From a paper:
This protein is localized to the ER membrane and is responsible for transporting acetyl-CoA from the cytosol to the ER lumen. Acetyl-CoA in the ER primarily serves to acetylate the lysine residues of secreted and membrane proteins, as well as the terminal sialic acid residues of gangliosides. Notably, disruptions to SLC33A1, whether due to insufficient or excessive activity, can lead to various diseases, especially those affecting the nervous system.
Subsequently, we resolved the cryo-EM structure of the SLC33A1/acetyl-CoA complex to a resolution of 3.5 Å. In this structure, SLC33A1 exhibits a typical fold characteristic of the major facilitator superfamily (MFS), adopting a cytoplasm-facing conformation. Of note, the two halves of SLC33A1 open to the membrane’s edge between TM5 and TM8 near the cytosol but are securely closed on the opposite side, between TM2 and TM11. This configuration strongly suggests that the substrates would likely access the central cavity through an intracellular portal framed by TM4, TM5, TM8, TM10, and TM11. On the ER side, the luminal gate is predominantly sealed by the interaction of TM1–2 and TM7–8. Our results revealed that mutations Y225A, N229A, Y390A, and Y418A significantly impaired the transport activity of SLC33A1, highlighting the importance of the polar and π–π stacking interactions with the 3′-phosphorylated ADP moiety for the recognition of acetyl-CoA by SLC33A1. Importantly, our molecular dynamics (MD) simulations further revealed that the binding of the 3′-phosphorylated adenosine moiety of acetyl-CoA to SLC33A1 is stable, whereas the binding of the tail part, including pyrophosphate, pantothenic acid, β-mercaptoethylamine, and acetyl moieties, is relatively unstable.
Numbering used by the authors: 71 to 278, 294 to 476, 505 to 537
């Protein structure tokens, strides 16, 4: 069934294109020198892909007659998302402010990328339901690893490829003979091209209830998973400050967003390799053991991010930017994403350990939803608390990183044994 799994791979690359763009916009807005209250108001865009389960039964409960049950919300979501990308490519010339140095109207850009993300998340639900019925039962795990590789490849084409092809600096150092300004593609041309790709793949793929919410209310009423809910909400505060603010403080204190995006291309082979290493801790009877043993390493790499942002102004920016800075920040991001990926596969292994086969297909993604909510809300609280902590004499990111590391080690030393006993 190669004729369908390549189409499903292409639909997950088109899933990853809005996520890649939504991850690229904070780097662009920080390159335009916007304040962090505006950045935290933008950071609501990362929440619908986390909280897609809150409308997943609403989009899996209804469909149209004499048509596919999940194709009924695949192709209208794809058409609305593509037409919205055409309109956003028209209006993004004035939303970012590339005309006469105007300020980025971030609120309209927030609601644009928020509804855009929302459409991306419900299209992910439509494909994740569509994967169970289009291909055979024998290839059901191939759909899951195809979701993984397609999401990562489409996020690569929107976060890394777009920023690598967005500026004049990288596109006149590399990828071009006879250098010329304004880069390969702007955001208007990139959005217009992927909107055209959305419309054509949508036309080709088209021509060729409250009981679930009552169940979710009963689950979140159940005590042990409610304890896991509160724990995974208050868990990721300790490193969400580093993981949310460091990528923008590096853009302010000097390293370009294009190099910070291209810094992720050595990580996708390691993103392949690392679950094949931590598969033993996944299959083990205590799946939160590598969570609890990767928590302090992730907080110490949060301090190492704070030290790296402190070290960024003390290295020379003029002329050829040095490669030892890039090998330091690449080993830093490499070890930090090692502990990110070990923590994430520990959460996935805990959900596979706990989720019963009765309502497992809902309870699995419920715990995934609540872990991603607990990952994405202290991002917004961190970016909102950047600006009141700037005493720039004393910067706010360093005192925020110290306070959030104290919150994370407080979480660790106070709620370690409880979170370790929740798996029994
Ligand atoms: C929305 C989604 O895609 S799924 C979210 C739920 N899953 C999770 O694991 C929780 C993580 N929650 C987050 O918010 C994560 O930081 C992300 C990955 C979703 C990114 O959201 P943000 O808070 O806006 O972080 P941001 O995109 O600004 O990071 C700056 C970029 O520069 C890079 N970067 C970050 N830190 C550094 C650093 N110290 N040095 C060099 N580069 C860095 C990263 O490649 C990052 O891009 P990414 O999205 O691939 O991680």
């Amino acid at each position: 069934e190669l004729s369908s799994i390549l189409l499903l791979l292409f639909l997950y690359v088109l899933q990853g294109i809005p996520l890649g763009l939504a991850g690229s916009i904070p780097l662009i807005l920080q390159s335009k020198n916007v304040s962090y209250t505006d950045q935290a108001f933008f950071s609501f865009v990362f929440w619908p892909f986390s909280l897609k389960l809150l409308w997943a039964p609403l989009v899996d409960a209804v469909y149209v007659k004499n048509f596919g049950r999940r194709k009924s919300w695949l192709v209208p979501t794809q058409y609305i998302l593509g037409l919205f990308m055409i309109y956003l490519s028209t209006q993004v010339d004035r939303l970012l402010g590339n005309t006469d140095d105007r300020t980025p109207d971030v609120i309209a850009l927030t609601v644009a990328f928020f509804l855009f993300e929302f459409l991306a998340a419900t299209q992910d639900i439509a494909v994740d339901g569509w994967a169970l019925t289009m291909l055979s039962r024998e290839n059901v795990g191939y759909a899951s690893t195809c979701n993984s590789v397609g999401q990562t490849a489409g996020y690569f084409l929107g976060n890394v490829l777009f920023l690598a092809l967005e500026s004049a600096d990288f596109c006149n150092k590399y990828l071009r003979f006879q250098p010329q300004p304004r880069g390969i593609v702007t955001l208007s041309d990139f959005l217009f091209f992927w909107g055209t790709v959305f419309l054509i793949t949508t036309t080709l793929v088209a021509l060729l209830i409250t009981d679930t919410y009552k169940l979710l209310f009963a689950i979140i009423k159940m005590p042990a998973v409610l304890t896991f809910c509160l724990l995974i909400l208050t868990a990721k505060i300790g490193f969400s400050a580093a993981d949310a603010v460091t990528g923008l403080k590096l853009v302010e204190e000097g390293v370009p967003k294009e190099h910070l995006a291209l810094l992720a291309v050595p990580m996708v082979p390691l993103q392949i390799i690392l679950p094949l290493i931590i598969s033993k801790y996944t299959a083990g009877p205590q799946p939160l053991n590598t969570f609890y043993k990767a928590m302090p390493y992730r907080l110490l790499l949060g301090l190492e991010y704070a030290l790296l942002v402190w070290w960024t102004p003390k290295v020379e920016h003029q002329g050829g930017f040095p490669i030892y800075y890039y090998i330091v920040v690449l080993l830093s991001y490499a070890l930090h994403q090692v502990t990110v990926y070990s923590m994430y596969v520990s959460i996935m292994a805990f959900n596979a350990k706990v989720s019963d086969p009765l309502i497992g297909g809902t309870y699995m993604t419920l715990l995934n939803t609540v872990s991603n909510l607990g990952g994405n809300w202290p991002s917004t609280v961190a970016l909102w608390l950047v600006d009141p902590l700037t005493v720039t004499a004393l910067d706010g990111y360093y005192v925020e990183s110290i306070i959030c590391v104290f919150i994370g080690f407080g979480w660790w030393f106070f709620l370690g044994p409880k979170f370790k006993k929740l798996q029994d």
